[PDB]
Design an enzyme around this catalytic site. Structure first.
Site, mmCIF file in Angstrom:
data_model
loop_
_atom_site.group_PDB
_atom_site.id
_atom_site.type_symbol
_atom_site.label_atom_id
_atom_site.label_comp_id
_atom_site.label_asym_id
_atom_site.label_seq_id
_atom_site.Cartn_x
_atom_site.Cartn_y
_atom_site.Cartn_z
ATOM 1 N N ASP A 1 0.846 -1.194 0.000
ATOM 2 C CA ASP A 1 0.000 0.000 0.000
ATOM 3 C C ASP A 1 0.883 1.247 0.000
ATOM 4 O O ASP A 1 1.259 1.751 1.062
ATOM 5 C CB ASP A 1 -0.931 -0.039 1.208
ATOM 6 C CG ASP A 1 -1.973 1.051 1.183
ATOM 7 O OD1 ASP A 1 -1.921 1.915 0.282
ATOM 8 O OD2 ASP A 1 -2.849 1.039 2.072
ATOM 9 N N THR A 2 1.193 1.755 -1.195
ATOM 10 C CA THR A 2 2.046 2.933 -1.307
ATOM 11 C C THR A 2 1.362 4.196 -0.799
ATOM 12 O O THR A 2 2.048 5.188 -0.531
ATOM 13 C CB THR A 2 2.487 3.138 -2.759
ATOM 14 O OG1 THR A 2 1.338 3.317 -3.597
ATOM 15 C CG2 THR A 2 3.287 1.941 -3.251
ATOM 16 N N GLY A 3 0.041 4.186 -0.662
ATOM 17 C CA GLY A 3 -0.682 5.309 -0.109
ATOM 18 C C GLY A 3 -0.779 5.311 1.398
ATOM 19 O O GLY A 3 -1.490 6.151 1.963
#
Ligand code: NJA
EC number: 3.4.23.16
Lengths: 99, 99
Positions: free
Chosen positions: B25-27
């Site tokens: 999850d890069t966010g």
């Protein structure tokens, strides 16, 4: 380009003629943008994450440009704290994770 | 490896001697895992998501293995809808976005 993750992967996007900052988010199935008054038809929807749900308005076939890469797809609009580019559009611009 | 985004980037992680499925999850600034027992001390902390703020237990210097890559960092345990691997650990394994 190559975007490291030391900081939030924020990039400039162009949606409906306006420029905004948005998060390239591999954890989001779909794209969620901050409240804005887009034209066209929409349908209500509830989306959930950490902290619960928010009500959004789903627009279809919306064009947005990400760092010069054009992409068109579903966009959800509502009271999100940040603009979120989800996988539905990340794939269109040829974005991948690499490690 | 290289991971495309037409499906959710789910991977198998090893933590506390147990295997689990988690989302890359890069966010997400931080790594947040569903309810589980972990050894060591922990302090209460708050984190906000798309829907609001939740109470979580903060475990520092936890060993996590992600697709064979070792990382040692902070792990938040609480009522997250999905086990998410955040940027605090994605950087440790040298993860980047490319397009
Ligand atoms: C939880 C994951 C499974 C899903 N989410 C993406 C995740 O990347 C969020 C994105 C985000 C949300 C608010 C503020 C900053 C970033 N990050 C996050 O919650 O991080 C946490 C942990 O670390 C800290 O950093 C930041 C906030 C804190 S979602 O937003 O809820 C979402 C649900 C449904 C859709 C459509 C319907 O498919 C699209 C997006």
């Amino acid at each position: 380009p190559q975007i490291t993750l030391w900081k939030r992967p924020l990039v400039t996007i162009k949606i409906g003629g306006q420029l905004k900052e948005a998060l390239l988010d591999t954890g989001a199935d779909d794209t969620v943008l901050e409240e804005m008054n887009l034209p066209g038809r929409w349908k209500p929807k509830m989306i959930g994450g950490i902290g619960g749900f928010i009500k959004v308005r789903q627009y279809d076939q919306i064009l947005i440009e990400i760092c010069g890469h054009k992409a068109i797809g579903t966009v959800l609009v509502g009271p999100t704290p940040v603009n979120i580019i989800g996988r539905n559009l990340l794939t269109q611009i040829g974005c991948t994770l690499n490690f």
